[PDB]
Design an enzyme around this catalytic site. Structure first.
Site, PDB file in Angstrom:
ATOM      1  CG  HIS A   1      -1.152  -0.217  -7.878  1.00 17.37           C
ATOM      2  ND1 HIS A   1      -1.609   0.631  -6.891  1.00 17.37           N
ATOM      3  CD2 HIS A   1      -1.567  -1.456  -7.527  1.00 17.37           C
ATOM      4  CE1 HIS A   1      -2.268  -0.066  -5.982  1.00 17.37           C
ATOM      5  NE2 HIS A   1      -2.257  -1.336  -6.345  1.00 17.37           N
TER       6      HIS A   1
ATOM      7  NE  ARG B   1      -3.959  -1.641  -0.281  1.00 18.52           N
ATOM      8  CZ  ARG B   1      -4.357  -2.087  -1.476  1.00 18.52           C
ATOM      9  NH1 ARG B   1      -3.770  -1.650  -2.595  1.00 18.52           N
ATOM     10  NH2 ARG B   1      -5.360  -2.966  -1.557  1.00 18.52           N
TER      11      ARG B   1
ATOM     12  CD  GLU C   1      -1.087   4.305  -7.950  1.00 16.50           C
ATOM     13  OE1 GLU C   1      -1.112   3.718  -6.833  1.00 16.50           O
ATOM     14  OE2 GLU C   1      -1.258   3.724  -9.041  1.00 16.50           O
TER      15      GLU C   1
ATOM     16  CG  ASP D   1       3.583  -2.490  -7.868  1.00 14.35           C
ATOM     17  OD1 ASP D   1       3.815  -2.194  -9.055  1.00 14.35           O
ATOM     18  OD2 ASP D   1       2.523  -3.044  -7.511  1.00 14.35           O
TER      19      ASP D   1
HETATM   20  N1  LIG Z   1       0.185  -3.837  -5.340  1.00 12.01           N
HETATM   21  C1  LIG Z   1      -0.865  -4.597  -5.719  1.00 12.01           C
HETATM   22  O1  LIG Z   1      -1.085  -4.774  -6.934  1.00 12.01           O
HETATM   23  C2  LIG Z   1      -1.743  -5.280  -4.586  1.00 12.01           C
HETATM   24  C3  LIG Z   1      -2.817  -6.156  -4.911  1.00 12.01           C
HETATM   25  C4  LIG Z   1      -3.654  -6.803  -3.963  1.00 12.01           C
HETATM   26  C5  LIG Z   1      -3.444  -6.596  -2.605  1.00 12.01           C
HETATM   27  N2  LIG Z   1      -2.384  -5.718  -2.243  1.00 12.01           N
HETATM   28  C6  LIG Z   1      -2.130  -5.489  -0.791  1.00 12.01           C
HETATM   29  O2  LIG Z   1      -1.016  -6.276  -0.241  1.00 12.01           O
HETATM   30  C7  LIG Z   1      -1.181  -6.335   1.209  1.00 12.01           C
HETATM   31  C8  LIG Z   1      -1.145  -7.729   1.810  1.00 12.01           C
HETATM   32  O3  LIG Z   1      -2.321  -8.401   1.325  1.00 12.01           O
HETATM   33  P1  LIG Z   1      -2.732  -9.859   1.893  1.00 12.01           P
HETATM   34  O4  LIG Z   1      -3.760 -10.528   1.041  1.00 12.01           O
HETATM   35  O5  LIG Z   1      -1.524 -10.648   2.273  1.00 12.01           O
HETATM   36  O6  LIG Z   1      -3.371  -9.491   3.309  1.00 12.01           O
HETATM   37  P2  LIG Z   1      -3.872 -10.324   4.588  1.00 12.01           P
HETATM   38  O7  LIG Z   1      -4.966  -9.513   5.229  1.00 12.01           O
HETATM   39  O8  LIG Z   1      -4.157 -11.742   4.204  1.00 12.01           O
HETATM   40  O9  LIG Z   1      -2.559 -10.189   5.531  1.00 12.01           O
HETATM   41  C9  LIG Z   1      -2.083  -8.964   6.094  1.00 12.01           C
HETATM   42  C10 LIG Z   1      -1.405  -9.369   7.386  1.00 12.01           C
HETATM   43  O10 LIG Z   1      -0.642  -8.268   7.879  1.00 12.01           O
HETATM   44  C11 LIG Z   1      -0.789  -8.218   9.298  1.00 12.01           C
HETATM   45  N3  LIG Z   1      -0.493  -6.864   9.759  1.00 12.01           N
HETATM   46  C12 LIG Z   1      -1.285  -5.797  10.004  1.00 12.01           C
HETATM   47  N4  LIG Z   1      -0.553  -4.699  10.265  1.00 12.01           N
HETATM   48  C13 LIG Z   1       0.707  -5.147  10.243  1.00 12.01           C
HETATM   49  C14 LIG Z   1       1.873  -4.461  10.667  1.00 12.01           C
HETATM   50  N5  LIG Z   1       1.833  -3.249  11.244  1.00 12.01           N
HETATM   51  N6  LIG Z   1       3.044  -5.176  10.611  1.00 12.01           N
HETATM   52  C15 LIG Z   1       3.089  -6.456  10.199  1.00 12.01           C
HETATM   53  N7  LIG Z   1       1.989  -7.124   9.841  1.00 12.01           N
HETATM   54  C16 LIG Z   1       0.779  -6.492   9.881  1.00 12.01           C
HETATM   55  C17 LIG Z   1      -2.158  -8.743   9.627  1.00 12.01           C
HETATM   56  O11 LIG Z   1      -2.151  -9.236  10.979  1.00 12.01           O
HETATM   57  C18 LIG Z   1      -2.338  -9.794   8.518  1.00 12.01           C
HETATM   58  O12 LIG Z   1      -1.934 -11.107   8.935  1.00 12.01           O
HETATM   59  C19 LIG Z   1      -2.527  -5.665   1.481  1.00 12.01           C
HETATM   60  O13 LIG Z   1      -2.306  -4.262   1.681  1.00 12.01           O
HETATM   61  C20 LIG Z   1      -3.303  -5.792   0.168  1.00 12.01           C
HETATM   62  O14 LIG Z   1      -4.380  -4.826   0.272  1.00 12.01           O
HETATM   63  C21 LIG Z   1      -1.546  -5.073  -3.205  1.00 12.01           C
HETATM   64  C1  LIG Z   2      -6.800  -2.324  -8.278  1.00 15.67           C
HETATM   65  C2  LIG Z   2      -6.552  -3.818  -8.277  1.00 15.67           C
HETATM   66  C3  LIG Z   2      -6.448  -4.304  -9.695  1.00 15.67           C
HETATM   67  C4  LIG Z   2      -5.260  -4.165  -7.525  1.00 15.67           C
HETATM   68  C5  LIG Z   2      -5.347  -3.876  -6.029  1.00 15.67           C
HETATM   69  O1  LIG Z   2      -4.358  -3.402  -5.444  1.00 15.67           O
HETATM   70  C6  LIG Z   2      -6.522  -4.170  -5.313  1.00 15.67           C
HETATM   71  O2  LIG Z   2      -6.874  -5.369  -5.213  1.00 15.67           O
HETATM   72  O3  LIG Z   2      -7.228  -3.264  -4.800  1.00 15.67           O
END
Ligand SMILES: NC(=O)c1ccc[n+]([C@@H]2O[C@H](COP(=O)([O-])OP(=O)(O)OC[C@H]3O[C@@H](n4cnc5c(N)ncnc54)[C@H](O)[C@@H]3O)[C@@H](O)[C@H]2O)c1
Ligand SMILES: CC(C)CC(=O)C(=O)O
Ligand SMILES: NC(=O)c1ccc[n+]([C@@H]2O[C@H](COP(=O)([O-])OP(=O)(O)OC[C@H]3O[C@@H](n4cnc5c(N)ncnc54)[C@H](O)[C@@H]3O)[C@@H](O)[C@H]2O)c1
Ligand SMILES: CC(C)CC(=O)C(=O)O
Lengths: 330, 330
Positions: free
Chosen positions: A295, A234, A263, A258
Site C-alpha cells: 500500500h 482499493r 491486508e 498495491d
Molecule cells: N493505494 C493508495 O495508496 C491510494 C491512495 C489514495 C487514494 N486511493 C484510491 O484510488 C481510487 C481512485 O481515487 P480518485 O481520487 O481518482 O477518485 P475519484 O472519486 O476522483 O474518482 C473515482 C471515479 O470512479 C468512478 N467509478 C465509480 N465506480 C466505478 C466503477 N464501478 N467503474 C468505473 N468507474 C467507477 C466514479 O464515477 C469516479 O469518477 C479511490 O479508491 C481512492 O480511494 C488509493
Molecule cells: C492511508 C493513506 C496514507 C493512503 C490512502 O490510501 C488513503 O488516502 O486513505
C-alpha cells in the site's frame, strides 16, 4: 495559532517542522493516534490534525467539544473510521485531503505496468538464481503498442490516462459517471468492451460496496489472454481467488497489486502472531509475474509533503475563514 | 527469391515464417551463426541475413563471392565484428537496422527509472524477507518532479526525452553534435551543468573509445547527492569501480545497468567455468538499489519483429533496386 497533530509518521516530521517555521504557527506533533486518552493532550489547542486507520470514536469528539476545539482535519482521504454522528452531535467540523498527489498513484500504476510488460520480476528471479542466459529469455512488450483500459476517470484516473497516452498507447476508459465534454486522450467504452479489448487494465475506482469484486470470474473470462491488471485503488475490487486461478491457468500474464484484498486481516495476524498466516499471500508473493507492494502507491515525497501542508492549510482555513474547500459532511 | 538466415533466435522464428508467407519468398533459417563452415549452406541463395556477436571473417566473404552472393544484411546495429576490408575486397555489400525500435530502449530506461524512484528493489527485498512493515518505509519520488538529464539526443535519446517530458519532468540534454533548430521539450546544457543539475542521468550515447568512462569519478563528484544513473547504451560508458564506491558512500541513490561493463568477459567465464567469477557483479547484484538486466533493453516483440522484417526488406531492396537506406560502408 496552536495546532496539535496526531499519528505523525517518520517522513512527515520534517514537513511539520517546516510548516511551523513557514507560517509562524505553533505545531506540536505526536506519534500516537488520536483516541479518548490522547485527545486530552489537545486541551488548549485551536485545532487537531490527524492521520490514522484506527477509529475516531464518539468520546474523542466529546472531549474536543469540552475543550472548545471545533475543527479536525485529516491528512488522508477516507472518513469511514470516523463517528460522523458523534462528530455532528458535538458540532465538530472536518476536512480531508482528497488529492494530495494523484501523480504519485498514477506514476506507481505506470511503474507496475512497465515492470510487468518487461517481465522484470522473471528477469530478477533468474539473475538472483545465477542464470544470466535464462534471465534474457522473457520477451517484453512496448506500452506504446498496447491498448490500456482505465476504470474510473476521476482525479487519479485522468492523470493515469495522460501518462499512458504519453507512451503512445491507445487508451479506452469506463466510468458510470462519464466526464462531460471533450477528452481527446481516450474514448469511453462499455465495461464489456474495456475487458475484451484491453492489454492492460488499470483500476482507479472507489472501494464502495457495489464495486466489491467488480473484477471477478466473469470479468476475467471476457479478458483477452495475456492481459495485465493493475490495482492501486482499493482491496475489495478484485476477487483474489479468481485472480489466482487465472494467473495459474495463464489467462493473466501478470498483476500489480498495491492494495491486497486481505491486508487489514493480515496486519492484525502480523501483530498477534508475527506473520500474515495467509497462504494466498504466500502463493502470490512467490510468483515472479505478480508484483505486490505494501500500500505505497501514494508514497512519494511530494504526496507526503502535500498531506501535511494541505491538511494544515484546511485547518487554518476553518480557523480563519470558517470554511474550506474540502469540508466533509456525510 | 531465396534467402538464408543465420543466428535465428527463439523469438525470431515466428517472424521468419510469417515474412515468408507475407512475401512469397523462400526463407531458410538456421540457429547456427555464420562462419567459414556454415557459409557453405548458403550456396544457391540470393542473400544472407544474420545476427551474431561472433566474427564475420574474411573466409566468409570469400565463399560468398564464390557462390555469387553479393549481399549480407544484419538484424542488429553493430558492425565492429565484421571484416569490412575482406568484405569490400570480395565486393560484398552490407546493411544493418539502426532503429528497429528506439521505443523499446527508451521504455526500458523509463522502466528502470520508475523502479528506482519508487525503491522497488528495496520493497521487494523486504517483502521476500517477510517484513511487510519495513517494505513500506522507503519513500519514493515522482518523476514529474525531477530534472532528468539525457546524454545523447540521437534516435533513442529523442524518444526518451519525449517519454520523460510526458511525466512533466524538466528535461535537459547534452550532445556534442546538437540538433539544429527548435526542440520545445528540452534545453541543451553543458556536460558540467547536466551532471550538477540532474536528479536522473540517462545515457544514450555511442560506445566509441572516446566515450569510455565518460561517467567517471570526476563526473560522480559533480553529481548531486541522491542522483540516479541509467545505462541502456554501451558497456564502456561508466567506470563501474567508481560507480560502486559512489553507491556505497551514498552519493548515488541507485543505478540501472542493462549493459554491464564486463559482460563480454563474464559470458566467456560462464561458458568455460559455469559462473561469471566476477566479484564486482556479485556485489552489485546484492544491492537492492541496483537494477541489473542482461542486455535486454531492446527486447520487445515489436523490436524483434522489426529486426526481422526491416533487415529482410533491406535485403530485398539490395536484390531489386540495388540500393537501400541503411547500407554500411565504413
Ligand atoms: N493505494 C493508495 O495508496 C491510494 C491512495 C489514495 C487514494 N486511493 C484510491 O484510488 C481510487 C481512485 O481515487 P480518485 O481520487 O481518482 O477518485 P475519484 O472519486 O476522483 O474518482 C473515482 C471515479 O470512479 C468512478 N467509478 C465509480 N465506480 C466505478 C466503477 N464501478 N467503474 C468505473 N468507474 C467507477 C466514479 O464515477 C469516479 O469518477 C479511490 O479508491 C481512492 O480511494 C488509493
Ligand atoms: C492511508 C493513506 C496514507 C493512503 C490512502 O490510501 C488513503 O488516502 O486513505
Ligand atoms: N542495450 C541495448 O539493448 C541497445 C540496443 C540498440 C542500441 N543500443 C545503443 O544505445 C546508444 C544510443 O543509440 P542511438 O540509436 O540513439 O544512437 P544515435 O547515433 O542515433 O545517437 C547517439 C548520439 O549521441 C551523441 N554523442 C556522442 N558521444 C556523446 C557524448 N560523449 N555525450 C553525449 N552525446 C554523445 C551523438 O552526437 C549522437 O547524436 C548506442 O550506443 C546504441 O549502440 C543499445
Ligand atoms: C545484440 C542486439 C540484439 C542488441 C544491440 O545492442 C545491438 O543492436 O547491437
Amino acid at each position: 495559532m496552536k495546532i496539535i497533530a496526531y499519528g505523525a509518521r517518520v517522513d512527515e516530521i520534517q514537513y511539520f517542522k517546516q510548516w511551523a517555521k513557514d507560517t509562524g504557527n505553533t505545531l506540536e506533533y505526536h506519534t500516537e493516534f488520536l483516541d479518548e486518552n490522547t485527545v486530552e493532550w489537545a486541551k488548549g489547542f485551536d485545532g487537531i490534525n490527524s492521520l490514522q486507520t484506527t477509529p475516531y470514536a464518539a468520546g474523542v469528539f466529546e472531549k474536543m467539544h469540552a475543550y472548545g476545539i471545533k475543527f479536525l482535519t485529516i491528512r488522508n482521504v477516507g472518513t469511514d473510521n470516523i463517528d460522523m454522528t458523534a462528530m455532528k452531535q458535538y458540532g465538530i467540523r472536518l476536512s480531508n485531503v482528497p488529492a494530495y498527489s494523484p501523480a504519485a498513484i498514477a506514476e506507481f500504476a505506470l511503474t507496475d505496468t512497465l515492470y510487468l510488460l518487461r517481465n522484470m520480476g522473471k528477469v530478477q528471479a533468474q539473475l538472483q538464481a545465477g542464470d544470466y542466459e535464462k534471465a534474457g529469455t522473457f520477451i517484453g512488450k512496448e506500452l506504446g503498442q498496447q491498448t490500456v483500459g482505465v476504470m474510473g476517470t476521476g482525479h487519479i484516473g485522468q492523470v493515469a490516462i495522460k501518462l499512458f497516452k504519453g507512451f503512445g498507447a491507445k487508451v479506452i476508459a469506463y466510468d458510470p459517471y462519464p466526464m462531460k465534454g471533450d477528452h481527446p486522450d481516450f474514448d469511453y467504452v462499455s465495461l464489456e468492451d474495456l475487458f475484451k479489448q484491453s492489454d492492460v487494465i488499470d483500476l482507479h475506482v472507489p472501494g464502495i460496496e457495489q464495486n466489491t469484486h467488480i473484477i471477478n470470474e466473469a470479468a476475467f473470462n471476457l479478458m483477452k489472454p495475456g492481459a495485465i491488471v493493475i490495482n492501486t485503488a482499493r482491496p475489495n475490487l478484485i476477487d483474489t481467488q479468481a485472480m489466482l486461478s487465472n494467473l495459474k491457468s495463464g489467462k493473466l500474464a501478470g498483476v500489480g497489486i498495491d492494495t491486497y484484498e486481505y491486508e487489514t486481516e493480515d496486519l492484525l495476524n502480523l501483530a498477534k502472531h508475527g506473520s500474515f498466516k495467509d497462504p494466498l499471500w504466500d502463493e502470490l508473493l512467490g510468483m515472479p509475474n505478480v508484483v505486490l507492494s505494501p500500500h505505497i502507491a501514494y508514497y512519494t515525497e511530494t504526496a507526503v509533503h502535500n498531506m501535511v501542508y494541505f491538511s494544515l492549510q484546511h485547518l487554518v482555513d476553518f480557523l480563519t475563514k470558517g470554511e474550506t474547500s474540502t469540508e466533509v459532511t456525510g
